[PDB]
């Protein structure tokens, strides 16, 4: 930073050292869209993947094939500014090279010969600007990233249980990116059910039947086997001793002449070990023991061939007798228990009404498509298309990754479709969970929740549109000539353009950009929401989703969320957080080996993070060296624990990582309550830019980075020297340091000046540099709106006193000094846009004309020939902006009017006055007019003067660029020409265009001169055609809506001064409305005569528990003094001795035990320059949670000259008597919010009414009426106020006779008019009559 | 939680303590916001019945 950023750095005041700087703030947008547009990546996402999914498009005839080669994006037809002007989406044309291929030759296997290939136009796709925003139909929009549970597999349970609640049920769910959900769940009887597409429960085994698994196969899949043997006409069991655990012997367990367990003995671990030691693998069992069991396979009598028992049949004495009789020597049965090996599937087969694959497919089809019976082919096809065809079902790469990790697959790569093994494995895991082996998992964890940024959503809609386009293609292949088809004939791009335009225009996640101040937009781009398509509806949204989860640490800001309904649903990315390729939010940590903290940083996902023990960033270090504490505070799992240095795997980077960019900007945040901090965070977004804006005297150190990352401020690309500085532009000559520019030199930065934002605030940039100034890379050139010398300025630094004042600060209200208005503090510039249209009517054309019926020259004075108010004129409410006449619907006047007109002889006119007028409560100076007239319409002076002006401006825009380019390249070719062929007094004579003819001795330098000579002509020719392009759009185009002859836009600028009813607030959550503006002499003042700016009530502090505002005030008092002290030094006998004092002082805040950073010395001239800028207002940096601490503030107060408490004797301006106690007074940083009385105050007597309801309606000049609702009616009823209520219900609303009579009676002075039934009641009656019910008003 | 917050707003508290708080704060604001909606409903029921 040049001159040390003019050296206003002040002091960091916190000893935590940040190993990494904050990542690009907008990166979540910029990188996502960069990834979406791509450049034929052949990598995941970015329209490439969409093309890959949609193509090749198959024949449906065994011959056609439409395949995709590659796509390209052209250049935008119109520049952003133009797009904003003409209401056109800023976008680039999309083309795709496609080859229609005949599919193989007849009887010749594959590879046909003829292919028709062409590049088809798919329409335009919107481009993201530099700052991460889009321009859609003229208006800036941001696409908010979306948080969601996403695709994968989930295993959960129900905390509610049965109605009785005495139960537990487990479930599993597979969510894909595209296609039907698959659910599994237990019922209270432990039966297992499946849901397809969230439809009604079917017994689960059906799907296995649908797979092609027989009953036998299912049983084999789900049961370990107990094998029995028949021999010696006795029964034996192949013994696995483990299986006996926890049981009591129901028979003598014996082998080899030894009884291991007597009947009736409980089987012990020792018994099992004894059996295992002696290798006992076969024991005799009674028939009753086997009769309990379930057979695992069908058995036939292998002599007769007849079935004895089927798989899953429960055995019995009869079945056992038959099996023995048939000569079978082995019987396979299921191993089950009531704990960890439950059968469940066996009973599920029983409740399953299906018996084979076909019946399963038929049942599934019936469930999906009721009211018809399916063919085999239809059912098979439907089932195949449910989960086993990627055109209808896709998990996606991320979904497959999550699924595979959950099911313990070795790889995360895999197919989009499900396999039978996937489903089987999910069922097996669920059954395991029910059995108690392993457990469920939680879904709200940020490992199971991921973000869909702009790119993913855009690609989603692109993919949809592409699929529709494919539908259109597939249709087109069959119709028409099948022999003669180009890709151009085959492809209609309308569906894709429709899908994209729909996404960018009408989507919920596509939002009107917020630009109130730089922080507003910066925060808006880092927004995350759980709402939108594929998300919560707010009925879905309960406590669980809105809660702050522990895994939000370092990822999602726990502080910054909306107040009210959207709470917990809308959030903000943490400062250091990044979203990975899979879509998971990652946070950085420093690797710690031994006790040594490396400077290497690993970005970890929440699941990744859960493995290690992570120490806090504030933990002490002896430097490197090693960790300096014997016991460290660390994080691992949910739990937070104290840990030895050896056990520390990682460590936090900064305190800042927890909080959002907005939350960061709150000083002494550690002293402020979270609820109020929330309000401060949210309210900083609402701060209005002020003309005189200054950086806060108490900053957090983030205020520069915010101004940098939001593109409002202008910075230097490379080192260089400033050639020119203007209100309009800044010319910078590069190569001053390291001589980076080559092959031509210099760069010109045009500045935005008095532009109008979405919310009507003025966006303008002001130059912060001076001609010939040395700037480095990244140095501030121009300040944007609400920024001071590259620092964020959302408000002003005012001198505040905390004390009650005559009840004027009652209940959060605020009192201010007239001096603030005097010095134009908290004055805000605003530009409003008004618009009028003249259209073709059936009654004749509307015309924009200076000629308007019955108007004096006084009213028409500020209008030009056309009828449009001239630039610079002052307009006030009621004044005409654009004159317009409309054809009268026409009617003969009443005879009295006939007479009146005749008496005054005015003669009526065919036309009626429709001119656009300035609304009430508005006014200002006309700073712009824009006029668009239908193409080839009769154009007058209106569309000629402005045009000619634009031609002059464009031509001057070429002369200045060619001036800078000439004096930018020739000043480089001169230093090259001199070297070798020195011609000082000779070269500065001949014309500049002759310097090219002069050659130079054979050398590599000549090549340099030649290259500069080619680049001159090239660039120049590009700026010439650049002027041409401007001389085209001005004299053609605009493309207006049908019926509209002409549109006029008038930009009026208004300056609003702070007044009673306006809302002010600080960063700590202290907000209030101005209640009183009292003259300076009434203001409480310091002994030396200085009056305070603001009086805040102290009663707002204790209940709210936001301490920080006080500390900010104290430090602000200190700062108020030190700069003032410097000012005094500046006033008289200014010498470097003062610099000795200043360096002493900053290095004194540093001299105080802990020092964040040190800075001293430097050039005397630089010290002098820096001295004035820092002297006027001292600055301060107090970082979040590593801040300025009381003792240090006391020290500054000492250099300040104290009082240490921060309280001073204050005199009452009305009396002169001192307030009876010492009162704290300090500089607080306060912002003026977007809520202003001017905007909100409105009133109506009578006005426009609605067509159908006849209720009072808000017109364009008539304000409309307030809603008197049910509760207000209750209020009037409880007061027993019958006539007031009746007035509300009749005369004051929908009764035409009642309101006309009331008005007439009032202007004549009268009592309430007769009521009439409210017109909406007559409407109700008539509507009930149309329903065919007889409704009859009746007499007594 | 086993460990309390030793700090007091005058002193200021470690980042972990604050984070572990945000939850309570959020639950509070959400509570009040829902509360207006529910209270309104009760009021309407009582009005309709009386």
């Amino acid at each position: 930073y040049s001159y040390t950023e003019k050296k206003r750095i002040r002091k960091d005041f916190g000893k935590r050292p940040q190993v990494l700087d904050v990542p690009y703030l907008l990166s979540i947008q910029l990188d996502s869209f960069q990834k979406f547009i791509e450049q034929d990546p052949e990598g995941q996402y970015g329209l490439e993947a969409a093309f890959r999914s949609v193509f090749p498009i198959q024949s449906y005839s065994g011959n056609s094939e439409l395949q995709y080669v590659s796509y390209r994006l052209g250049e935008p037809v119109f520049d952003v500014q133009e797009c904003q002007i003409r209401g056109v989406t800023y976008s680039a044309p999309l083309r795709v090279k496609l080859r229609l291929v005949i599919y193989e030759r007849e009887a010749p296997e594959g590879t046909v010969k003829d292919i028709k290939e062409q590049e088809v136009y798919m329409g335009e796709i919107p481009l993201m600007t530099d700052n991460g925003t889009f321009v859609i139909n003229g208006t800036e929009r941001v696409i908010v990233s979306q948080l969601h549970r996403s695709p994968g597999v989930f295993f959960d349970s129900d905390k509610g249980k049965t109605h009785s609640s005495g139960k537990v049920l487990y479930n599993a769910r597979i969510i894909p990116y595209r296609g039907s959900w698959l659910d599994f769940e237990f019922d209270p009887k432990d039966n297992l059910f499946v849901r397809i597409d969230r439809r009604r429960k079917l017994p689960a085994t059906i799907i296995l039947r649908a797979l092609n698994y027989t009953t036998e196969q299912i049983l084999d899949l789900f049961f370990e086997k107990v094998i029995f043997e028949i021999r010696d006409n006795k029964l034996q069991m192949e013994l696995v001793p483990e299986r006996l655990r926890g049981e009591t012997a129901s028979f003598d367990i014996e082998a080899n002449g030894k009884v291991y367990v007597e009947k009736g003995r409980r089987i012990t671990a020792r018994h099992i070990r004894q059996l295992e030691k002696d290798d006992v693998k076969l024991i005799e069992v009674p028939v009753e023991y086997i009769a309990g069991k379930v057979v695992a396979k069908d058995y036939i009598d292998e002599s007769t061939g007849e079935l004895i028992c089927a798989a899953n049949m429960e055995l019995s004495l009869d079945l056992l007798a038959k099996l023995s009789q048939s000569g079978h020597k082995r019987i396979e049965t299921l191993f089950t228990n009531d704990l960890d090996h439950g059968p469940y599937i066996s009973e599920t087969l029983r409740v399953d009404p299906t018996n084979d694959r076909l019946s399963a497919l038929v049942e599934i089809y019936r469930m999906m498509r009721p009211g018809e019976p399916p063919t085999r082919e239809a059912a098979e096809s439907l089932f195949e298309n449910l989960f086993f065809s990627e055109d209808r079902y896709d998990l996606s790469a991320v979904g497959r990754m999550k699924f595979n990790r959950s099911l313990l697959r070795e790889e995360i790569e895999g197919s989009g479709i499900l396999s039978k093994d996937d489903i089987i494995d999910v069922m097996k895991k669920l059954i395991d969970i029910r059995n108690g082996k392993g457990e469920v998992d939680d879904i709200d964890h940020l490992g199971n929740r991921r973000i869909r940024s702009v790119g993913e959503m855009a690609e989603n809609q692109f993919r949809v549109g592409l699929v529709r386009v494919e539908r259109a293609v597939k249709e087109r292949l069959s119709l028409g000539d099948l022999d003669t088809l180009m890709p151009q004939d085959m492809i209609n791009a309308k569906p894709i353009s429709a899908a994209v335009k729909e996404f960018f225009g009408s989507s919920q996640l596509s939002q009107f950009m917020d630009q109130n101040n730089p922080l507003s937009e910066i925060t808006h781009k880092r927004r995350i929401s759980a709402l939108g398509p594929g998300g919560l509806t707010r009925e879905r949204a309960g406590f669980e989703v809105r809660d702050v989860h522990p895994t939000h640490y370092g990822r999602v800001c726990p502080i910054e969320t909306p107040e009210g309904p959207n709470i917990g649903l809308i959030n903000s990315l943490s400062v250091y957080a990044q979203t990975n390729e899979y879509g998971f939010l990652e946070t950085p940590y420093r690797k710690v080996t031994d006790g040594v903290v490396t400077d290497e940083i690993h970005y970890l996902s929440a699941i990744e993070e859960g493995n290690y023990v992570i120490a806090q960033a504030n933990s002490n270090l002896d430097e490197e060296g090693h960790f300096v504490e014997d016991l460290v505070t660390c994080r691992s799992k949910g739990e937070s624990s104290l840990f030895s240095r050896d056990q520390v795997d990682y460590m936090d980077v900064s305190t800042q990582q927890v909080v959002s960019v907005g939350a960061s900007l709150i000083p002494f945040l550690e002293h402020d309550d979270a609820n109020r901090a929330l309000m401060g965070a949210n309210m900083q977004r609402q701060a209005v830019p002020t003309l005189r804006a200054d950086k806060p005297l108490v900053g957090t150190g983030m205020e520069r980075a915010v101004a940098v990352d939001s593109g409002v401020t202008a910075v230097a690309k490379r080192g260089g020297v400033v050639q020119y500085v203007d209100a309009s532009r800044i010319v910078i000559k590069v190569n001053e340091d390291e001589m980076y520019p080559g092959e031509a030199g210099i760069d010109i930065y045009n500045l935005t000046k008095y532009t109008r934002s979405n919310q009507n605030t003025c966006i303008n940039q002001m130059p912060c540099v001076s001609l010939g100034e040395p700037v480095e890379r990244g140095d501030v050139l121009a300040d944007g709106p609400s920024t001071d010398l590259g620092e964020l300025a959302l408000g002003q630094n005012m001198r505040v006193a905390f004390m009650p004042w005559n009840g004027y600060n009652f209940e959060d209200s605020i009192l201010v000094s007239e001096r603030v208005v005097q010095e134009d503090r908290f004055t805000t510039i605003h530009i409003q846009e008004l618009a009028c249209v003249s259209r073709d009517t059936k009654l004749g054309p509307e015309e924009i004309t200076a000629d308007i019926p019955n108007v004096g020259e006084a009213a028409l004075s500020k209008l030009d020939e056309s009828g449009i108010v001239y630039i610079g004129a002052e307009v006030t409410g009621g004044d005409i902006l654009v004159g317009k006449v409309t054809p009268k619907g026409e009617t003969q006047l009443t005879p009295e009017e006939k007479l009146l007109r005749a008496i005054f002889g005015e003669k009526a006119s065919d036309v009626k006055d429709s001119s656009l007028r300035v609304p009430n409560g508005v006014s200002g100076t006309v700073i712009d007019v824009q006029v668009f007239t239908r193409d080839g319409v009769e154009k007058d002076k209106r569309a000629l003067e402005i045009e000619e002006m634009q031609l002059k401006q464009a031509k001057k825009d070429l002369s200045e660029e060619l001036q800078i380019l000439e004096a930018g390249l020739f000043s480089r070719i001169r230093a090259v020409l001199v070297a070798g062929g020195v011609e000082a007094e000779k070269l500065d004579k001949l014309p500049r265009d002759r310097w090219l003819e002069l050659g130079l001795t054979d050398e590599e330098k000549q090549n340099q001169l030649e290259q500069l000579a080619e680049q001159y002509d090239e660039l120049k020719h590009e700026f010439e055609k650049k002027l041409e392009a401007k001389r085209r759009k001005i004299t053609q185009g605009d493309d207006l809506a049908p019926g509209v002859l002409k549109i006029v836009k008038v930009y009026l600028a208004v300056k609003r001064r702070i007044q009673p009813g306006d809302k002010m607030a600080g960063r700590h959550g202290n907000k209030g409305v101005i209640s009183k503006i009292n003259p300076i002499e009434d203001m409480p003042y310091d002994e030396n005569g200085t009056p305070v700016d603001i009086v805040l009530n102290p009663l707002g502090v204790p209940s709210r528990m936001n301490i920080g505002q006080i500390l900010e005030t104290h430090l602000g008092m200190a700062a108020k003094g030190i700069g003032d002290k410097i000012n005094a030094m500046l006033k008289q006998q200014q010498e470097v001795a003062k610099l000795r004092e200043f360096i002493q002082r900053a290095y004194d805040l540093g001299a105080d035990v802990r020092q964040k950073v040190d800075l001293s010395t430097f050039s005397d001239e630089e010290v002098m320059r820096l001295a004035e800028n820092l002297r006027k207002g001292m600055p301060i940096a107090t970082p979040v949670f590593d801040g300025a601490k009381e003792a240090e503030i006391k020290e500054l107060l000492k250099l300040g000259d104290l009082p240490t408490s921060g309280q001073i004797r204050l005199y009452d301006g009305r009396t002169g008597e001192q307030f009876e106690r010492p009162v704290t007074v300090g500089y607080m940083y306060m912002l003026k919010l977007n809520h202003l009385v001017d905007d909100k105050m409105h009133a109506r007597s009578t006005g426009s009414y609605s067509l159908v309801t006849q209720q009072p309606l808000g017109g364009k000049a008539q304000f409309g009426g307030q809603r008197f609702g049910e509760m207000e009616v209750w209020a009037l009823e409880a007061y027993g106020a019958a006539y007031t209520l009746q007035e509300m219900l009749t005369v004051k609303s929908d009764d035409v006779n009642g309101r006309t009579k009331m008005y007439k009676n009032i202007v004549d002075g009268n009592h309430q008019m007769e009521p009439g039934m409210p017109e909406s009641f007559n409407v109700l009656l008539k509507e009930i009559r149309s329903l065919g019910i007889n409704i009859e008003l009746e007499d007594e | 939680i086993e460990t309390p917050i030793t700090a007091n707003f005058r002193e200021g508290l470690n980042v972990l303590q604050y984070f572990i708080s945000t939850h309570g704060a959020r639950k509070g604001l959400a509570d009040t916001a829902l509360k207006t909606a529910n209270s309104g409903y009760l009021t309407r029921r009582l009005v309709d019945v009386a």
Partner: peptide, 7 residues
């Protein structure tokens, strides 16, 4: 902590 065991 304050309200809601927060505060």
């Amino acid at each position: 902590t304050x309200x809601f065991x927060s505060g």
